[PDB]
């Protein structure tokens, strides 16, 4: 196509154009739209007049807000000693020998990169708001601009519309001087501000003294939040925050595909290892402040692509996003919560059981309904729901996204969740077949398979990881004729035995209880009315036979109709899961953000007293009851036990299990796993 990069200063526009000419005879090409501001570029990308632009984390928060809904497409990478992550560190630079601490900043003069930028404004002013030095309570006590103008004696905050005091130390002419591209703008202009004696403090990133005064580094210090002062190189132990990198945003559409093609071209041709006169990232030399950080920051070394599930809210993190909002609303007022556990139900039957839970607890629990169980993960990460109970396979995924197992399911007896005088708790993964059949473990190829869902412990992680040991492929779709493994791609072989809903919009091969064949009992039902194997839990056959499941298909079933398949030998008795299983796996657990673990552990124990297996109001509601549909919780559950504080998903899951998912993930990784893997490697 011709990618329309938006620029915001006449030097940037000028660089934009040298790249138009070096790419002018290529497949993906370029134009360089120049507007007066970065917001004027956000509007032009939202109105199809330009296509891309790289924005500071605080401006990436604005681009993602409606009407605009602009997405993170690409992210800058920085030289890290850890790795080379897509984040940087905000630091506050002062001169060696001035005596003040972070506690003495009142009355001083300050130099900021820009109003609303992360290191230059959001992190310092938000941090001072929270320590109690800048006194702001919420928008009803003034703007943040008025609150800072009473703290600092004069500042240069190139962006300030309201207070004139924030433009007083700025350098340049009577109109242009307090603009976002003025000489004292950006990380280096704010550094020159300090170097020229105009600020006592400069709020910049961890690389700024090295980008503008490398031999003069010994004349400068950093202000640490513990009251101390350290050297400019000790930023890793003396920073104010680690923030998300600057990111290339764009309209969420087909053009995205080309914006990355173009950028991966110039990364390869014009990067850090280049020999041309065109440098895309840099070079980071001492230079005029106005020629610094054009189009991309001089500190970038390459671009990394953000996975498509991401949105600004998700890119910036819960802690930082919640900070930019703080500075837009009074604290008491939208902040009551710790009295209500917002549970996340998946699909319609789980929505029904949760609304009764919410009616019968006179409100102590409320419900969010989603469609897939990956949506619950995202809702909890964003602070829009608080807990959900997930399977061992799906706890791995939440564990990569930073959620923690706070309570887990105990499948044996009711009194056993009070334990000193025993520890552990697990269930078993199993291969079930009908006794008439010819199939055994090694006969398993080219057959029909029934799976609880793609992604889950017993019905996919254990079986596919043993078929992946032998097969050496991540194409289990070619290892059967067909199956029903809900959640797979809709037009494949593992979708064909699946039935769908009643059959109204029909929804087959979906990962909720709308699909007939979903979960442990839906996959016994697949074995029974259509397939060769059912990859299930050890008790799925006892629970649905001997007359206990009173549905059509299950009315007549007895446990003599089936047999297990051991990794090898025989076929075995369905009640010998101990000796003929595929694995002993950890149980299902409730996973929450680490800071909400206290509330919901306590709010959930109150709830099981009233509706647990020996609840006091069982009569109205029993929590681990669903009609063999394992709604909200598994039906086998006798009680729920507390998982000790500071337990990591890896420790809960066990090392034996931790290994298996870290084998199948070289095979096709889900879009949620990839997104969260960008954030843990951020
Ligand atoms: Fe920045
Ligand atoms: Fe399970």
Swiss-Prot record:
Keywords in alphabetical order: Allergen, Disulfide bond, Glycoprotein, Ion transport, Iron, Iron transport, Metal-binding, Repeat, Secreted, Signal, Transport
Protein name per UniProt: Ovotransferrin
PROSITE patterns on file: TRANSFERRIN_LIKE_1, TRANSFERRIN_LIKE_2, TRANSFERRIN_LIKE_3, TRANSFERRIN_LIKE_4
CDD domains for this protein: PBP2_transferrin_C (cd13617), PBP2_transferrin_N (cd13618)
Family label: Belongs to the transferrin family.
InterPro entries reported in the protein's UniProt record: Transferrin, Transferrin-like_dom, Transferrin_Fe_BS
Record carries keyword Glycoprotein: yes
Organism domain of life: Eukaryota
GO terms for biological process, alphabetical: acute-phase response; antibacterial humoral response; antimicrobial humoral response; intracellular iron ion homeostasis; iron ion transmembrane transport; iron ion transport; response to lipopolysaccharide; response to xenobiotic stimulus
Binding site for Fe(3+) 1: 56, 88, 187, 246
Annotated segments matching region Connecting region: 329-337
Annotated positions binding hydrogencarbonate 2: 452, 456, 458-459
SS bond partners: 6-41, 16-32, 111-193, 156-170, 167-178, 224-238, 344-376, 354-367, 401-676, 417-639, 450-526, 474-667, 484-498, 495-509, 566-580
Cellular localization per UniProt: Secreted
Glycan-bearing residues: 469
Keyword check for Secreted: yes
Function: Transferrins are iron binding transport proteins which can bind two Fe(3+) ions in association with the binding of an anion, usually bicarbonate. Responsible for the transport of iron from sites of absorption and heme degradation to those of storage and utilization. There are two forms of hen transferrin, ovotransferrin, found in the ovoducts and, serum transferrin, secreted by the liver. Serum transferrin may also have a role in stimulating cell proliferation and is regulated by iron levels. Ovotransferrin has a bacteriostatic function and, is not controlled by iron levels.
GO molecular function, one term: ferric iron binding
Start and end residues of each Transferrin-like domain: 3-329, 341-666
Gene Ontology cellular component annotations, sorted alphabetically: early endosome; extracellular space; organomineral extracellular matrix; plasma membrane; recycling endosome
Subunit structure: Monomer.
Residues binding Fe(3+) 2: 391, 427, 520, 588
Residues binding hydrogencarbonate 1: 113, 117, 119-120
Induction details: Up-regulated by dietary stress. Increased expression at day 14 in the magnum of the oviduct in the corticosterone-fed laying hens (at protein level).
Tissue distribution: Expressed in the magnum of the oviduct (at protein level).
């Amino acid at each position: 196509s011709v990618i329309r990069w938006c620029t915001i200063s006449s030097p940037e526009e000028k660089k934009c154009n040298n790249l138009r000419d070096l790419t002018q005879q290529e497949r993906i090409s370029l134009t360089c739209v120049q507007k007066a501001t970065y917001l004027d570029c956000i509007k032009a990308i939202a109105n199809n007049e330009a296509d891309a632009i790289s924005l500071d984390g605080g401006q990436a928060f604005e681009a993602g807000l409606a009407p605009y809904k602009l997405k993170p497409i690409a992210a800058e990478v920085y030289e890290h000693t850890e790795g080379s992550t897509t984040s940087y560190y905000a630091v506050a630079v002062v001169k060696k020998g001035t005596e003040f601490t972070v506690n003495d900043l009142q009355g001083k003069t300050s130099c900021h990169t820009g109003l609303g930028r992360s290191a230059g404004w959001n992190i310092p002013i938000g941090t001072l708001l929270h320590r109690g030095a800048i006194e702001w309570e919420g928008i009803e006590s003034g703007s943040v601009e008025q609150a800072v103008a009473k703290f600092f004696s004069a500042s240069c905050v190139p962006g300030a519309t309201i207070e004139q005091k924030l433009c007083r130390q700025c350098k340049g002419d009577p109109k242009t001087k307090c603009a976002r591209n003025a000489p004292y703008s950006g990380y280096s202009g704010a550094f020159h501000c300090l170097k020229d004696g105009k600020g006592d403090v400069a709020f910049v990133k961890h690389t700024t003294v090295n980008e503008n005064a490398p031999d003069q580094k010994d004349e400068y210090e950093l202000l640490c939040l513990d009251g101390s002062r350290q050297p400019v190189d000790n930023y890793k132990t003396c920073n104010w925050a680690r923030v998300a990198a600057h990111a290339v945003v764009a309209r969420d559409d087909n053009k995205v595909e080309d914006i990355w093609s173009f950028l991966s071209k110039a990364q390869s041709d014009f990067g850090v290892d280049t020999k041309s006169d065109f440098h895309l990232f840099g070079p980071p030399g001492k230079k005029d402040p106005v020629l610094k950080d054009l189009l991309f920051k001089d500190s970038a070394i390459m671009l990394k692509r953000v996975p498509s599930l991401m949105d600004s809210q998700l890119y910036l993190g819960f802690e930082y996003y919640s900070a930019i909002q703080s500075m837009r609303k009074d604290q008491l007022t939208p902040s009551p919560r710790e009295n209500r556990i917002q549970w996340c139900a998946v699909g319609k039957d789980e929505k029904s059981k949760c609304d009764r839970w919410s009616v019968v607890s006179n409100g102590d629990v409320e419900c969010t309904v989603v469609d897939e169980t990956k949506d619950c993960i995202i809702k909890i990460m964003k602070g829009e729901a608080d807990a959900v109970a997930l399977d061992g396979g799906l706890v791995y995924t939440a564990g990569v996204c930073g959620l923690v197992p706070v309570m887990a399911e105990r499948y044996d007896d009711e009194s056993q969740c009070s334990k000193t005088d025993e520890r552990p708790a697990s269930y078993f993964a199993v291969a079930v077949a009908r006794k008439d059949s010819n199939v055994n473990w090694n006969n398993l190829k080219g057959k029909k398979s029934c799976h609880t869902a793609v992604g889950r412990t017993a019905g996919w992680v254990i079986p596919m990881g043993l078929i992946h040991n032998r097969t050496g492929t991540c194409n289990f779709d070619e290892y059967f004729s067909e199956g029903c493994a809900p959640g797979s791609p809709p037009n494949s072989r593992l979708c064909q035995l699946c039935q769908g809903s009643g059959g109204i919009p029909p929804e087959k091969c979906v990962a909720s209880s709308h699909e007939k064949y979903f979960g442990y009992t839906g996959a016994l039902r697949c074995l029974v009315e259509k397939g060769d194997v059912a990859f299930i839990q050890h008790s799925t056959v006892e629970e649905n036979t001997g007359g206990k499941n009173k549905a059509d298909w299950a009315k007549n079933l007895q446990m003599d109709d089936f047999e297990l398949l051991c990794t090898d030998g025989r076929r075995a008795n369905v009640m010998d899961y101990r000796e003929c299983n595929l694995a002993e796996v950890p149980t299902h657990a409730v996973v929450v953000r680490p800071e909400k673990a206290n509330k919901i552990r306590d709010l959930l124990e109150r709830q099981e007293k009233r509706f647990g297996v020996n609840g006091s109001e069982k009569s109205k509601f029993m929590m681990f009851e669903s009609q063999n549909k394992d709604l909200l919780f598994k039906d086998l559950t006798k009680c729920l036990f507390k998982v000790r504080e500071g337990t990591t998903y890896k420790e809960f899951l066990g090392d034996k299990f931790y290994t298996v998912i870290s084998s199948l993930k070289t095979c096709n990784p889900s879009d949620i796993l990839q997104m969260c893997s960008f954030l843990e490697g951020k």
